[PDB]
Design an enzyme around this catalytic site. Sequence first.
Site, short mmCIF file in Angstrom:
data_model
loop_
_atom_site.label_atom_id
_atom_site.label_comp_id
_atom_site.label_asym_id
_atom_site.label_seq_id
_atom_site.Cartn_x
_atom_site.Cartn_y
_atom_site.Cartn_z
N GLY F 25 -1.53 -26.06 12.58
CA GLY F 25 -2.77 -26.81 12.37
C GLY F 25 -3.45 -27.23 13.68
O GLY F 25 -4.68 -27.17 13.81
N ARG F 29 -0.80 -27.97 19.88
CA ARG F 29 0.49 -27.37 19.61
C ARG F 29 0.50 -25.81 19.77
O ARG F 29 1.47 -25.23 20.24
CB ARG F 29 0.92 -27.76 18.20
CG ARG F 29 2.30 -27.25 17.83
CD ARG F 29 3.36 -28.01 18.61
NE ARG F 29 3.75 -29.22 17.90
CZ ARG F 29 4.57 -30.14 18.39
NH1 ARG F 29 5.09 -30.01 19.61
NH2 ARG F 29 4.87 -31.20 17.65
N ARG F 48 -15.02 -23.35 17.64
CA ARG F 48 -14.67 -24.64 16.98
C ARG F 48 -13.40 -25.31 17.52
O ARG F 48 -12.79 -26.14 16.84
CB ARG F 48 -14.57 -24.49 15.45
CG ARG F 48 -15.94 -24.34 14.79
CD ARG F 48 -15.83 -23.67 13.42
NE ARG F 48 -17.12 -23.64 12.73
CZ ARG F 48 -17.65 -24.66 12.03
NH1 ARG F 48 -17.02 -25.82 11.90
NH2 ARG F 48 -18.83 -24.49 11.45
N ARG F 92 2.95 -19.48 8.87
CA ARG F 92 2.51 -20.82 9.16
C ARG F 92 3.72 -21.70 9.50
O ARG F 92 4.74 -21.69 8.80
CB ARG F 92 1.73 -21.40 7.96
CG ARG F 92 1.00 -22.66 8.35
CD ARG F 92 0.21 -23.30 7.23
NE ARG F 92 0.96 -24.41 6.69
CZ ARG F 92 1.20 -25.55 7.32
NH1 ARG F 92 0.74 -25.80 8.55
NH2 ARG F 92 1.91 -26.47 6.69
N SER F 95 4.69 -29.51 10.31
CA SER F 95 5.50 -30.63 9.90
C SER F 95 5.19 -30.92 8.43
O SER F 95 4.17 -30.45 7.91
CB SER F 95 5.19 -31.86 10.78
OG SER F 95 3.81 -32.20 10.61
N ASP F 208 8.89 -36.70 8.31
CA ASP F 208 8.80 -37.98 7.61
C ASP F 208 9.54 -37.83 6.28
O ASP F 208 9.48 -36.77 5.63
CB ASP F 208 7.34 -38.39 7.29
CG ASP F 208 6.46 -38.57 8.54
OD1 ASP F 208 6.38 -39.69 9.09
OD2 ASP F 208 5.83 -37.61 8.99
N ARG F 222 8.40 -35.72 17.46
CA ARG F 222 7.30 -34.87 16.99
C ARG F 222 6.87 -33.88 18.07
O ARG F 222 6.68 -32.71 17.78
CB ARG F 222 6.10 -35.69 16.50
CG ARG F 222 6.43 -36.54 15.28
CD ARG F 222 5.27 -37.40 14.84
NE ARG F 222 5.76 -38.47 13.98
CZ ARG F 222 5.71 -38.48 12.65
NH1 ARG F 222 5.16 -37.47 11.98
NH2 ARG F 222 6.21 -39.52 12.00
N1 LIG Z 1 -22.80 -20.08 3.21
C1 LIG Z 1 -21.91 -21.05 3.49
N2 LIG Z 1 -20.86 -21.26 2.65
C2 LIG Z 1 -19.97 -22.22 2.93
N3 LIG Z 1 -20.06 -23.03 4.02
C3 LIG Z 1 -21.05 -22.95 4.94
C4 LIG Z 1 -22.07 -21.91 4.70
N4 LIG Z 1 -22.94 -22.01 5.73
C5 LIG Z 1 -22.53 -23.01 6.55
N5 LIG Z 1 -21.39 -23.60 6.09
C6 LIG Z 1 -20.71 -24.73 6.83
O1 LIG Z 1 -20.07 -24.13 7.97
C7 LIG Z 1 -18.64 -24.24 7.95
C8 LIG Z 1 -18.00 -22.90 7.67
O2 LIG Z 1 -18.44 -21.91 8.61
C9 LIG Z 1 -18.27 -25.17 6.82
O3 LIG Z 1 -17.59 -26.26 7.43
C10 LIG Z 1 -19.59 -25.50 6.11
O4 LIG Z 1 -19.93 -26.88 6.18
N1 LIG Z 2 3.17 -36.24 4.12
C1 LIG Z 2 2.21 -35.31 4.38
N2 LIG Z 2 1.17 -35.14 3.52
C2 LIG Z 2 0.20 -34.22 3.73
N3 LIG Z 2 0.21 -33.41 4.81
C3 LIG Z 2 1.18 -33.46 5.76
C4 LIG Z 2 2.27 -34.44 5.58
N4 LIG Z 2 3.10 -34.29 6.65
C5 LIG Z 2 2.59 -33.30 7.44
N5 LIG Z 2 1.45 -32.78 6.92
C6 LIG Z 2 0.62 -31.72 7.58
O1 LIG Z 2 -0.11 -32.37 8.67
C7 LIG Z 2 -1.52 -32.39 8.42
C8 LIG Z 2 -2.00 -33.78 8.06
O2 LIG Z 2 -1.95 -34.57 9.26
C9 LIG Z 2 -1.81 -31.43 7.29
O3 LIG Z 2 -2.55 -30.37 7.90
C10 LIG Z 2 -0.44 -31.05 6.70
O4 LIG Z 2 -0.22 -29.64 6.73
#
Ligand SMILES: Nc1ncnc2c1ncn2[C@@H]1O[C@H](CO)[C@@H](O)[C@H]1O
Ligand SMILES: Nc1ncnc2c1ncn2[C@@H]1O[C@H](CO)[C@@H](O)[C@H]1O
Lengths: 227, 232, 241, 229, 238, 238
Positions: F25, F29, F48, F92, F95, F208, F222
């Site tokens: 994620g 990391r 991004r 993937r 945690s 956790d 962590r």
């Molecule tokens: N046609 C689309 N469908 C879904 N998300 C979109 C689109 N155009 C722009 N977005 C925005 O851009 C991001 C995905 O590229 C999303 O976080 C969303 O908010």
């Molecule tokens: N208890 C939890 N609940 C939901 N997401 C978790 C938890 N622990 C770790 N994660 C992971 O970390 C991120 C949320 O900080 C998510 O992207 C998820 O994959």
Amino acid sequence: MAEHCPTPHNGAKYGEIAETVLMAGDPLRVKLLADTYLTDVVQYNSVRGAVGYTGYYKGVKLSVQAHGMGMPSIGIYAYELFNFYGVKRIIRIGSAGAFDESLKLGDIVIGMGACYDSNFERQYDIPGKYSCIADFQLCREAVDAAEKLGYRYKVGNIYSANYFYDDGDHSGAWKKMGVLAVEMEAAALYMIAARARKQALCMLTISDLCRRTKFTQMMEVALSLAK
Amino acid sequence: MAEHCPTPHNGAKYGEIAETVLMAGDPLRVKLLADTYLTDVVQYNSVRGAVGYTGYYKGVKLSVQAHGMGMPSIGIYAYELFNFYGVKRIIRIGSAGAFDESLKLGDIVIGMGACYDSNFERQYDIPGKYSCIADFQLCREAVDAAEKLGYRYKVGNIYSANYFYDDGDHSGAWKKMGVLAVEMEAAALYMIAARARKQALCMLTISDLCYGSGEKMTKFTQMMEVALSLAK
Amino acid sequence: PGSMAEHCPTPHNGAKYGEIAETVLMAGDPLRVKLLADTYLTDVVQYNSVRGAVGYTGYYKGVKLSVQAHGMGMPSIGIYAYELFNFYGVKRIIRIGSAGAFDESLKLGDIVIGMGACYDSNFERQYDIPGKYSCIADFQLCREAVDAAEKLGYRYKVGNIYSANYFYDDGDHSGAWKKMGVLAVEMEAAALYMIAARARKQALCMLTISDLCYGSGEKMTAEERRTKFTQMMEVALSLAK
Amino acid sequence: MAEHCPTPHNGAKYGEIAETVLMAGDPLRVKLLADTYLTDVVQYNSVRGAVGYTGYYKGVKLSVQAHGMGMPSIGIYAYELFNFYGVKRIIRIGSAGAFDESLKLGDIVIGMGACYDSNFERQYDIPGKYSCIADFQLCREAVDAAEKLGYRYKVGNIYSANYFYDDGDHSGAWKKMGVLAVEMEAAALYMIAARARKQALCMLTISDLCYERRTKFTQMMEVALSLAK
Amino acid sequence: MAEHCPTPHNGAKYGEIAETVLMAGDPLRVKLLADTYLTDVVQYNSVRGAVGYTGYYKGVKLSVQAHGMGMPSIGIYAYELFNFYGVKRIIRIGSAGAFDESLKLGDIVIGMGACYDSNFERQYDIPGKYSCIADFQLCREAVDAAEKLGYRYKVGNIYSANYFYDDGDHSGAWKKMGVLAVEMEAAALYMIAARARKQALCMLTISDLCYGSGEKMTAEERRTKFTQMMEVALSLAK
Amino acid sequence: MAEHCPTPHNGAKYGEIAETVLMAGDPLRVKLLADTYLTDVVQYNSVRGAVGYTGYYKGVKLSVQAHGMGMPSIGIYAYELFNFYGVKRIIRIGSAGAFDESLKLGDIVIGMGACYDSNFERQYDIPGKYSCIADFQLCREAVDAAEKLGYRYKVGNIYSANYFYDDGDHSGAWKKMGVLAVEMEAAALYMIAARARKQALCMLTISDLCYGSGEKMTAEERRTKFTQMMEVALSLAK
Ligand SMILES: Nc1ncnc2c1ncn2[C@@H]1O[C@H](CO)[C@@H](O)[C@H]1O
Ligand SMILES: Nc1ncnc2c1ncn2[C@@H]1O[C@H](CO)[C@@H](O)[C@H]1O
Ligand SMILES: Nc1ncnc2c1ncn2[C@@H]1O[C@H](CO)[C@@H](O)[C@H]1O
Ligand SMILES: Nc1ncnc2c1ncn2[C@@H]1O[C@H](CO)[C@@H](O)[C@H]1O
Ligand SMILES: Nc1ncnc2c1ncn2[C@@H]1O[C@H](CO)[C@@H](O)[C@H]1O
Ligand SMILES: Nc1ncnc2c1ncn2[C@@H]1O[C@H](CO)[C@@H](O)[C@H]1O
């Protein structure tokens, strides 16, 4: 709730984030916003690269924060801002695909309502269909501002999808319902805001038909909402 | 459009109904509104006692029409009005139960959005959850008119239920979500207007409290006055 | 149980407790209700004009009964039926209405007795039922109605009907109901049946086919509506006790 | 359609099964029924132990057949009987748990309607809630037969569950709604019969309370046998 | 829970059923398996004709038991076995229709996961979508045994339908998702095993092709070609 | 499909991403993973801030890429990787909170299946309940690696939630069903991989305990106590 700051997703201490937060998906864009419009910028967050900054815009303290992509991601950020940081107002800005054929590239869509694919509404245990709406006051101020600045806009329903790539073509039903544009976040924000009794609004610039000058115009509408 | 008039529910011929319709559930209330505020009144509908009148308010042509109770009933009338009769805007006035504890008996609620029990939406084959919203312009004008008249109002989410008598207590989750008030019609109106690309707004007066003492009314003219200020 | 004098009159019914009889016949249209009371009842008293949902109490062959308008759709009939069964002490509600024929063997004027009612969503969620609830009529009323139609020699069918939440459909959602053998469409029965089941009271919906949802889509004229609902009303009236 | 007989679940050729079939879950009870009530019995099925027999009851040709447990099981057998074997009527008989508190062990429940958990509906593409009902004529005849013999019965709604063992307690809303008893099969039978335009009815003896065993089942069998034409 | 044995569906007293149970739908096939593969056989059940036998296979006590057709049927039997009889391991064997076009008649499918029409997940009050899976260890031992003996197999998702006869054609979406084969039982077994913290696996022999021209096994191939799957299942006896 | 790269979320051209991709994620990391374990590292993405790198581990080319948080986010990246970049397997790593009370901090969970809150199953038009499962072969390899290295691990169901903050407590039913751990991404990855006929696995380190006294890993733990999982994951690169 000062005891809950910093959070696992936000390195800010309580008070480091303003009562008005502008949010956008892309951290590069959030940084450009901070550099373009704010003075005295301090970064309060770099956790997960979701940069957050606090500065001044025309003399009022304002924060700008990245929210990543999709309703679960913005959900985490908005929940923390409203419930832990004391934030009053979140304005989300971004780009969107137009569903409504009368929208031109660069038109502003003000998201009075957000349709959605199921996200985390189940966790509120609602026994029917919940309609996600923006705060009326932010919505009214955003419209007044566009009208004052003479920019082209439409206010109405947007759609917060869980997908960017469609395995089918599922857009036809939303188009028939009058939905204006598609993005991936607004509905989560509106729900969390409503539960917290706080104000949210999503504003969008049309960039695809299902740029710097156009986008800048969306900024002037959004920034006029800072308090 | 004209070929579909009169309908099984409406004896009006095309053109006998104005571009703005004000609607209320109760035909006795509709009759009152006609008798109180309109001149040169013609009754265009008596089908099923769902009375409809066309007249002038401050010399401007306006219709007023009963829609009965519940989403299927208002769905029929609004679908006909928008799709067969050329109506441009429907403003619905009604009574509601308060969910939000700061609303008192007689307060006005402006339904910016409407949550809902499943009605006829399956017919639209929507692959997600559709959020029912009012026309923004109507919404804003209703707020401005309420402000100018000095009325106590709130604008936000309402809930269009399928029931008046709850077999349990299902108001909890709606309350948590900030929903203001409960009625039985608005979501259907809003859906139908959105599909038609027409304008709709629901305004309500709190007549019963769905919290605390649960006090109820035995006083709707203020809401009529907001509604009337939207007629064009 | 079923009688709550302190809840009468209600917001939807001006009747005082006791002004409504133990058997109520209901129709959607207040003009049909008035006609029925005018044609068949003596010693008639109007107990409701709230919301134009006229209601009358009178006698037929020595038996006291009420006739009441219920408006259109499940939420509307749901309000009236809930009040009648829970507050007014009503034992029996017979709905009489018009319906569109799905079964191609049905002609205009034929009587459909709704042994069961399929439905679009109405009250089921508010009852917190964790599965699919089948809405059925009271067996005894159903059986009496079939016996009366049979003795009078009327064309009828008894089976499933469909309580829709829509009258208009831009498309066609009717094929699957027809395949399942559903006889006819209307908009109220299922909610009535569910509310009666909850209350442990009796309900039945009977219908006269006024429009054909197949073929060229023939429909009754206004005259035929006036005159071809007689057979059903008479069956319904013989169920009053 | 003779072309489809025998089936993967039924060894019968077209015509070996009569126009009226009595069905029960348990093959042992089906064999006992044939042995007790039928003359000139021929066994037409033994596939999967789901025994089926054809014989005469008081001069009228009749079949009785095992259907196993659960809606998917009865659905297979009922589908074949109505659509392949020319069967006109199916009367299912079985045991049930009582939901209605006034029901005693051995009371007969006639299922005018059947509530259900999902089984078959989705495969029919129904765009709303389908109410599963018995054939009116059979239901009426059963009620008259029970009434004439003066047995304790109720006629009304039953519930076809997908479970015998409840992980929690999900009976409460069914009870509030007046549902009489729980079994596991009726709604699938009703749906398949409605689709085929054929006749079905489920009758039950209360064997447990969800709130002389052989003799209790016999009264029901006698009511069931009255309906055979 | 010895106090719950015998049950309404099973005449066995506690201890008469082994810790590993092989299950199939057809009682005639269960009897055949017992006669063919087990020594010292005792029949512990004949209630509802759902025969059950206990004996020895290669020195280890093993039971074989009929489960009828459909998720509600297998649910009853599996619930009892895991919760009342102290069973640790259930392996279901049976036939299936191929959705995956690279499967041939007689291929073995090992059900790592099971898709399903609602049968009785509602009864567990799960607030989302529950994914039904086999026990990994059994799955791993089945795949190993299939490889060691050189059998044609695939391991992945199966579909537990509520219908044998489709009123429409609903197979398309499953095929698009990569689902391998359709049967009518596995998801319920898996859910019940997970709830009980015990082990379950379903293995299948492809007896019909639910794609292309719809080829079927002959009555003779049905009678004969389930032997390979047996040797795989029997590898799992513990 | 070379013509579809770069995408709106990924600056890489086709071929800049290896056939095996390890995803986490958090971009900080992912960066640490590339610096610690890979040689000859090239950065192919900064779009991004979702950084991606390609380099070598023990002679085998592999990529590591940030996927952000939640199913719709990982769904974007994984869809692109499998359908545009020619990627064959995605592992993937993350945690997770433990639901299973036998799990300790730092235990490794291998997600054979993933339960889920709605993501985009609706978008696939599936007429029932689709069980999200990992690729069996990755799953077997991961277990084998964990055994050879002697690490504590469990294999079973995980739950991909759409929330991190629970407005109530919805965990009871998942715990009851024997779900091992909660995260926010796996089901979507599994579904997309199945549709694409490609391989996916999620592995998690317990950070956790969502039970008992609620022990949580230290900030130091962590930062540093994820190497065991990373070594298992890296051994899956081909
Ligand atoms: N046609 C689309 N469908 C879904 N998300 C979109 C689109 N155009 C722009 N977005 C925005 O851009 C991001 C995905 O590229 C999303 O976080 C969303 O908010
Ligand atoms: N208890 C939890 N609940 C939901 N997401 C978790 C938890 N622990 C770790 N994660 C992971 O970390 C991120 C949320 O900080 C998510 O992207 C998820 O994959
Ligand atoms: N508490 C309430 N619940 C539902 N509808 C209400 C309530 N109070 C007033 N109403 C409105 O009044 C009418 C029913 O009395 C309905 O059409 C509805 O719009
Ligand atoms: N074809 C039809 N579809 C829906 N409702 C019908 C139809 N025919 C008659 N009705 C009845 O008449 C009213 C709608 O016209 C409803 O109250 C309903 O009960
Ligand atoms: N309480 C009960 N719940 C479900 N099915 C029951 C019950 N009692 C008897 N049955 C019937 O018996 C079988 C289950 O033992 C099913 O086929 C069902 O028809
Ligand atoms: N195509 C199929 N659809 C459903 N079940 C099948 C199919 N092929 C084999 N079966 C198996 O056969 C039995 C039904 O004959 C079921 O118990 C099921 O396990």
